[PDB]
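User: Hi! Is it possible to get a structure for several chains at once, not just one? Here's what I have:
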Amino acid sequence: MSISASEARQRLFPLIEQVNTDHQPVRITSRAGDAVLMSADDYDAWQETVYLLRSPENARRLMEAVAR
Amino acid sequence: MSISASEARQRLFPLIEQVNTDHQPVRITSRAGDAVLMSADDYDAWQETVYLLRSPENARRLMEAVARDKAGHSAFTKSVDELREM
Amino acid sequence: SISASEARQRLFPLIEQVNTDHQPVRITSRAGDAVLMSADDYDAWQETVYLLRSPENARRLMEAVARDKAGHSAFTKSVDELR
Amino acid sequence: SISASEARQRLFPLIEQVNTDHQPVRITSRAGDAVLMSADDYDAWQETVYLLRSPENARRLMEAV
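Assistant: Yes, the chains can be modeled jointly so their relative placement is included. Here is the combined structure:
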């Protein structure tokens, strides 16, 4: 799962299945710059958690509630 | 709040009570420079959380665990709700 | 956001786009949903929170980014003053 | 870490250390535990986290030249 763009183009569909089951990023290569394909749920989860880390109480809340 | 080093020297027990009740940091101001007093549990919880965030997959797992139970839900919702206010 | 059919068609232009404006693209499909972002945003996100494990590293990152913008010329000047 | 009664005796040198060393100090006490850190370092930490919300800002943190 570090591949050329032209191959990522043909395999796009299984690559979407993979990213949703694996939850690892796929590094895509090109003359145009590299891209990462990742699952929407991993992306959302990461952006949401970094937003919540704005408030240091929030991590304590989250940690405390898990361990319940 | 924000107070001088000279009064914080006097009021250290009550500022630590405050910091671990209201969870708002206290700026202590002085000739040298200024400092911030906060709750240690807030501080450590933050660090350890960031330690676990090695990759987006870890963020997803942490969101799962929050999704597991009623305790996770309300903690999460409350945090979202504060964030909606500010 | 765009479908996977279309993302498959336009992948090459989407790869250059995502590295030009640096905005991620949401891709929906019957197989599931993905996002496509530049490898640079992705690495920068991961690395930057990893650095932030110690909150003290935030000041250090700001100082490094400022040294970066200032240039090699600011450092040569320091060298010269030290002599 | 240090007790709150040691920290009271030495609050000035402590505020100076924390600004010079750019490392926090843990304070343990009867009223619970607290962390003392440089105000500027606290502010940079809060600001950086705020910023990290976009993957664009993160990119500009990494590729700042």
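The radius of gyration of chain A is 17 Å. Chain A touches chain B at residues 23-25, 38, 41-43, 45-46, 48-66, 68 (CB under 8 Å).

User: Great, thank you!
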